[PDB]
Design a protein around this ligand. Sequence first.
Ligand code: T8P
Ligand code: T8P
Lengths: 304, 304
Amino acid sequence: SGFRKMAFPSGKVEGCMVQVTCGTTTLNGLWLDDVVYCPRHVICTSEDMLNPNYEDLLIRKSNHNFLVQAGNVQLRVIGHSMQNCVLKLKVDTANPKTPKYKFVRIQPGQTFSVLACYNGSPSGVYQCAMRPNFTIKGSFLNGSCGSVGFNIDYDCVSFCYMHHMELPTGVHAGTDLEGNFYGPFVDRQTAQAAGTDTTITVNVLAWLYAAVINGDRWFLNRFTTTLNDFNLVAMKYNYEPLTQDHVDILGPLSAQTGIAVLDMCASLKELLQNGMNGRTILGSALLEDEFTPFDVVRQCSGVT
Amino acid sequence: SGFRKMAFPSGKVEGCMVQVTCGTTTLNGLWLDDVVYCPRHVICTSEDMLNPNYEDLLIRKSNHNFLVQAGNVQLRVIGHSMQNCVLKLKVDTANPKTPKYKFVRIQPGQTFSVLACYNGSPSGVYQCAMRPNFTIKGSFLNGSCGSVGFNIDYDCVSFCYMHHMELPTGVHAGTDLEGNFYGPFVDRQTAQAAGTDTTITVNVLAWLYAAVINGDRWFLNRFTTTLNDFNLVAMKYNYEPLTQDHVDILGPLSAQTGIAVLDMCASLKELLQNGMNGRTILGSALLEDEFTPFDVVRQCSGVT
Ligand SMILES: *CC(=O)N1CCN(c2ccc(OC)cc2)CC1
Ligand SMILES: *CC(=O)N1CCN(c2ccc(OC)cc2)CC1
């Protein structure tokens, strides 16, 4: 029993983190096979960052300008290319610790682990979600860019995020490992504001199922609802519309607990309308939305 | 910016996790040098667990009864001994991945990372605190016993916890790596209830400092207090007494923010008395007490 915000074990990703320096800028790169992946803004002077022309800035860079260090050993750069907002530095050595890996682009509401790094060295691991506004709520100081987000499926690391940007409101923007930003964000120091940070309804429901499984049941009530009725309340509270696809996804948790998805919706509806009244669920005073239904089943069943 | 509940990178500990089987019981062991450490209750039939005599049960066990598997490779057990509530299985092979390590016994209020494992395989990593009642609030299913808690100081893993027990109230009990239980807990299936789960005041203050550093300032007020006045309020709310030692520990955060420790105490006093009024601090609706002052300075500065 117990239910914790849990990251994937980080060892397979620790084995891939290197330091990338270009001029006076040091950040992180991801070393897979003979390619190091890093944010293209490694080539920018903070001056450049106001209105960078990356193709033009990159012309002034040679392979020997990209200093790539794995622990205390230098890697030899034998090629560099820009793909969208990442650079791919071809090195003469395959990372011997390269795990089985995929590059995946996740959807809003999907969770992942971040290995926060500075100068190619791991500092910590935490669990994030892609927010409906395509930001993430991270922990990233200067030097942390090129830190990556990932899921693990047994022995295969799916990389989904590389850190690039902090918005003036302290939330985070980044790319997939093809260098495409999540959401409308750009690697430029400009007026970019996040849209509404809506609550991931299907995740909240998953976490209420986790709560029931783990003995927290006070919020169960005598009510049910319909998707349409629930969605009127969701709308009012800046929750994502619940779809039949979400109901279908919650089926296994419904089955295990014997609580119909729409009954748990009516519980969530009452919590939205009435609040917690100073009570907690799984040690939280708010409705947690960074556990997916897959996360809850994984943690409640003990997958490795 | 941003502030997350952050675990240490788990790779160095992943490298130490093995499977231990005795009869029909499988749990986790920690392999350091040529010793595998595991809970002594691996020798118990669930029947034995009501009133086990461990010395007597251990007489029926030989080296060849302890099946120790590192990934898919068996380790040869050449000795076994009981130390307090752990077994030390001497194996014929030093773990080649043994990191620099220490065994430390932590105090209540100290935080650590747990690598939750099943059958010697890592499932996830999360951040815990030793509670003032000597429980931890973990995520541990059957098979997770022998999972360990740790801090890292650069390249040295300090192991502080091994998981043994769940109490009927769903909280966790375990030992240090010398096999001494934290608190009054025993490895027997008996009436053991946790005492008051008091809030770790110095940690809450550290986290309020983290909040100010990261832009969350609404709870700052025009008041101050004294340790004695604050402690009257702490007492009433089941918070730990704040000591001058705690004030001294918060000095660096005081200095960095320019907020006197006793002014932050007066902020915390108002939050205790008035509540959050539906507001959040660093995305929490309650006062977070599982960040130490050391954790806040580490995360806010970017140590690796
Ligand atoms: C996210 C990251 O690691 N980077 C972007 C910002 N960055 C930076 C460092 C130092 C200054 O001035 C002192 C400005 C920006 C480093 C790379
Ligand atoms: C914590 C842990 O891993 N263990 C203690 C409890 N345990 C156990 C397994 C199966 C049953 O009956 C089905 C009872 C207890 C396994 C080891």
